Ligand SMILES: CC(C)(COP(=O)(O)OP(=O)(O)OC[C@H]1O[C@@H](n2cnc3c(N)ncnc32)[C@H](O)[C@@H]1OP(=O)(O)O)[C@@H](O)C(=O)NCCC(=O)NCCS
Ligand SMILES: *SCCCCCCCCCC
């Protein structure tokens with residue numbers, strides 16, 4: 001007997017810019033491996049990693065996230081004032097509450113804008129990019145900041161001969177806003193719950209809290225299970241992303257898969273049938289697996305080098321913990 | 335050349351149903367006052383809480399969340415098969431990773447459907463409804479379970495005379511899907527990072543993990559600051575929620591504020607200039623504050639008691655940690 005208004009926002013949205021932040025401390029394979037039993041070679045050939053960046057003690061995912069935003073905003077040619085919202089996506093904010101998002105907002109000068117934390121393993125960014133495009137088109141925001149941020153350092157077990165050499169630290173954000181032409185395709189996402197513990201924190205925080213004498217919680221990865229999963233499944237997930245975007249594989253300019261493993265991403269490239277000249281993201285060689293921050297960071301590295309250029313038609317594929325996956329086709333920012 | 339394609343979905347969406355789970359174990363006011371200097375009369379008058387529910391030890395944000403989803407699914411007349419995505423929104427998932435959302439989807443038998451965790455303090459549910467609808471309108475999903483779940487019992491310092499009686503346990507899910515007529519108005523939200531520390535974890539998990547034998551983290555609350563905040567700021571918040579929906583104050587039949595404290599909520603009622611006979615959610619009486627679970631648990635209480643009616647016009651205002659608020663106008667579910 002009484003109507004709730006139906007509204008709408010702008011129909012064309014894109015990645016206005018990207019802005020990266022990588023902590024200054026460089027951690028070679030020799031440093032990493034000398035505390036287990038391995039070698040430079042052994043790590044390089046199984047993963048693709050050479051060096052990785054670890055954050056300083058006083059740095060957090062929120063701090064790094066703040067610095068990332070500032071740069072995206074700078075690159076987008078905008079102030080904090082132009083932003084209606086921030087989505088902080090991450091798995092390494094070490095407080096149950098308050099959420100990182102508002103803190104990131106306050107640091108920027110836009111104290112009062114909307115914002116939340118989003119958790120979907122490594123594929124968080126994919127879901128965040130996704131959620132922002134839907135919110136702008138819905139008419140609940142005109143311009144937004146989405147930031148992938150991570151400080152995985154303190155979570156690594158230095159005695160874990162499987163994954164201590166994998167995870168690293170950093171942040172990178174995109175300004176999502178209205179563009180003349182459609183810049184972000186429809187989100188393609190899904191997951192696999194049976195295999196949740198493939199990538200996990202081994203002990204919950206409260207169980208750890210109630211029994212201090214036990215072992216502390218560290219990150220644990222089941223290599224073969226996660227390799228197999230991503231390597232043989234994300235190809236089709238990649239095809240759907242382009243299916244929804246109305247784009248043929250021959251037309252993909254830039255391939256940004258999550259930087260978990262160079263061997264995984266090598267297999268996905270053959271599988272996806274791209275041009276022989278398609279620019280594959282390989283930021284992992286000097287960044288490592290920065291989880292939810294991988295793709296945006298990876299975008300900026302391709303951008304920094306020139307291998308990718310603003311407007312290039314990019315396939316973004318994210319896969320990781322929870323066994324989650326979120327892909328879209330996008331145009332390149334900056 | 336080569337344009338990125340857009341998808342579109344249902345123009346009008348709404349709360350098809352609500353499913354609620356509260357754990358069997360009642361904890362009385364006297365029982366709370368064992369490890370603090372207080373009484374039943376002191377707690378009830380200053381909060382409006384008489385009793386609350388504490389979860390069993392084998393339970394969790396995920397277990398509870400799952401139970402709530404079934405209850406919702408059953409009320410809407412749907413099975414897992416009908417769901418395309420799930421959003422778990424919590425502050426008491428005690429794993430940095432993996433997200434609860436996948437494990438929850440798995441538990442229901444929708445193993446591969448999309449989803450993720452959303453963290454925005456107490457206003458979590460507000461954002462999650464907002465993102466759910468936004469996604470469905472953008473055509474990335476046709477029908478979604480949004481579940482707010484919380485196991486706060488283990489985060490409570492039983493010696494905290496300031497809050498040990500405030501927080502409780504439970505979960506509640508809604509089903510969002512297409513409806514004949516508009517059922518959820520735009521989302522109005524925002525934050526206050528300056529006062530990020532009003533509701534908090536006092537010690538992050540990493541700091542604590544490197545010093546396990548010392549003080550462990552609990553939830554902290556700066557009573558007056560949050561009272562003062564909510565009591566004088568949520569008025570215009572709600573006003574904005576009714577403005578976007580194209581409804582007047584006199585038109586709201588059911589007010590559902592976040593269940594922080596009955597006093598705060600009575601002042602909201604007055605400030606909002608609702609009808610004298612408008613129905614006001616007071617689920618706190620035997621549920622206490624369940625953060626991101628409160629609003630939808632409230633919706634359920636009113637429906638169960640026949641105090642609210644399906645399709646009744648409703649105003650939802652969420653407020654809490656990070657200093658985050660999300661609010662919308664909706665028609666009542668179930
Ligand atoms: C903190 C709160 C409980 C009131 O306590 P308070 O008066 O600020 O506590 P103080 O430490 O200043 O002590 C003041 C007095 O209260 C008395 N007191 C008695 N029982 C008390 C109790 N259970 N808790 C706190 N104070 C109590 C103290 O003895 C003290 O003595 P005095 O009045 O003779 O000086 C109040 O802010 C409150 O109701 N909080 C929850 C409701 C709320 O604001 N919720 C928003 C949550 S999101
Ligand atoms: S997809 C990989 C993301 C890694 C997140 C794990 C966070 C660390 C958990 C151990 C405390």
Ligand SMILES: *SCCCCCCCCCC
Pocket residue numbers: 095096097425426455456457486489533534535536551552553554625653654655
């Ligand atoms: S709005 C209330 C949000 C508080 C969530 C409780 C968990 C916070 C960490 C306490 C250890």
